[PDB]
Amino acid sequence: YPKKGLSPLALNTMDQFSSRLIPINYDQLKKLDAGKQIKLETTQVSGNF
Amino acid sequence: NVGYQNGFTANVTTNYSHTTDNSTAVQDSNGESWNTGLSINKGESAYIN
Secondary structure: OOOOOOOOOOOOOOOOOOOOOOOOOHHHHHHHOOOOOOOOOOOOOOOOO | OOOOOOOOOOOOOOOOOOOOOOOOOOOOOOOOOOOOOOOOOOOOOOOOO
């Protein structure tokens, strides 16, 4: 959606329409201190043709 | 460069953004730098309009 050669989007920037940012506790941070990476998942999209 | 060795007579870029993308050029500089009229330390901020 930002094409090849352009800048990426932001996620939950501090604005009028936003949300609380996402917290990590200590134990998940210590697991992130190992080689365990974050998986992004998409449930379903709603679109038109 | 100087020569081309064959009938190309054109050059290829590394970035091909369209004309919807422009880089605005500052002018009337006069040597007077950006941190001169306004005092910014190592960890301060400055807002844009």
